[PDB]
Amino acid sequence: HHLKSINHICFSVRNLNDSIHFYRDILLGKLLLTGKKTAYFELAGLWIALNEEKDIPRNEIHFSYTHIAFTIDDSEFKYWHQRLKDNNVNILQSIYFTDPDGHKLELHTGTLENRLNYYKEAKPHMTFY
Amino acid sequence: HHLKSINHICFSVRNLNDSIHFYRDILLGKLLLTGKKTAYFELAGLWIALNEEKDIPRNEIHFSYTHIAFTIDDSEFKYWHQRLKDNNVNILQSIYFTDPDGHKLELHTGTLENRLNYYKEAKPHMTFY
């Protein structure tokens, strides 16, 4: 009875047109649908839905407790770093960054297996299953 | 130069042992690693990382602006509905629910293609690309 796969992710965003430029132009996703308050993309093989909420407060911290990471090839690290820098993206191996609203994103060059093997050497008092 | 795939998701959680029971026992994910403040799972083919933050306020609304949906087969809908109900999960075709902390999750039985075709009939004034 297991869950089969990730199906989609939805993000609330304050300005649809800023978020379409981010996900479509900067991150090279495919725009598939728009409405007044909605946009769907396919990005990295994943359906991403954006829901526009123009009243999310800009003077408060939100989006603190989740991050989403996408895979890139190690050889593409400098290309992506430079692409995000040249697009004035908020940047915090991995590249940590935010979308225009503050949703926390990451580009990462390794696998879960790579990370487990790293921790078995670096953090050997963790418990491995 | 495209992003290749989703790599992982990380959630902050207030109690690791409550969240391991949710993701491992209720959602049938695989526990791969633990530390004092960390747990890694593979769930639905996706690496999920949990980071324990015991001080996330319990008396405030958080996690409002993201949701993550997983695919199930249509025939499994009543099995999952009943499994979440029998485990006293907060439940809000799709099943909408939250983890123990309030991260918003969904089980969904359709594809992006199915949803686009639905909107072309139901919401024909959207723009399709």
3-state DSSP call for residue A85? helix
Residue A74 near residue B6, CB atoms below 8 Å: no
- Alpha-carbon distance of B73 to B95, in angstroms, equals 12
- Report residue B126 as tokens: 């959207």
* Among candidate residues A127, A53, A88, A7, the one with its CA nearest the CA of residue B6: A7
Does A10 sit within 8 Å of B69, measured CB to CB?
A: yes
Total number of domains in chain B? 1
Tell me which residue range forms the domain holding A76.
Answer: 1-126
Give the residues across from A11 on adjacent strands.
Answer: A50, B66
CA distances B107 to A11, A45, A92, B20, B68, Å, are: 16, 18, 32, 19, 9
Q: What CATH number is associated with residue B31?
A: 3.10.180.10
A60 is catalytic: no
State the amino acid at position A34 in one-letter form: T
Pairing of the two strands B30-34 and A127-128: antiparallel
**Contacting residues for A57 by C-beta, under 8 A, at least 6 apart:** none
- Alpha-carbon distance of A69 to A96, in angstroms, equals 9
Helices and strands: H and E segment counts in chain B: 3, 9
Instruction: Identify the sign of the CA torsion B104, B108, B113, B117.
Output: negative
- Report residue A89 as tokens: 């993206």
**H-state helical runs in chain A:** 16-20, 77-86, 112-122
Residues of chain A in contact with residue B101, where contact means CB-CB under 8 angstroms, are: 65
| Active-site hit among A53, A76, A106, A121 | A106
Å resolution of this model? 1.4
Residue B105 near residue B87, CB atoms below 8 Å: no
State the amino acid at position B32 in one-letter form: L
Interface check B81 vs A, CB under 8 A: no
- Obtained via which technique? X-ray
As to burial, measured by CB atoms within 10 angstroms (0-12 exposed, 13-18 middle, 19+ buried), residue A27 is: buried
- Alpha-carbon distance of B38 to A115, in angstroms, equals 13
Residues of chain A in contact with residue B128, where contact means CB-CB under 8 angstroms, are: 32-33
- Report residue A79 as tokens: 């290309």
CA distance A108 to chain B (A): 7
Q: Which long-range contacts (CB under 8 A, 24 or more apart) does A93-101 make?
A: A94/A69, A96/A67, A98/A63, A99/A11, A99/A13, A99/A19, A99/A22, A99/A23, A100/A13, A100/A14, A100/A15, A100/A18, A100/A19, A100/A22, A101/A11, A101/A12, A101/A13, A101/A14, A101/A19, A101/A56, A101/A62, A101/A63, A101/B65
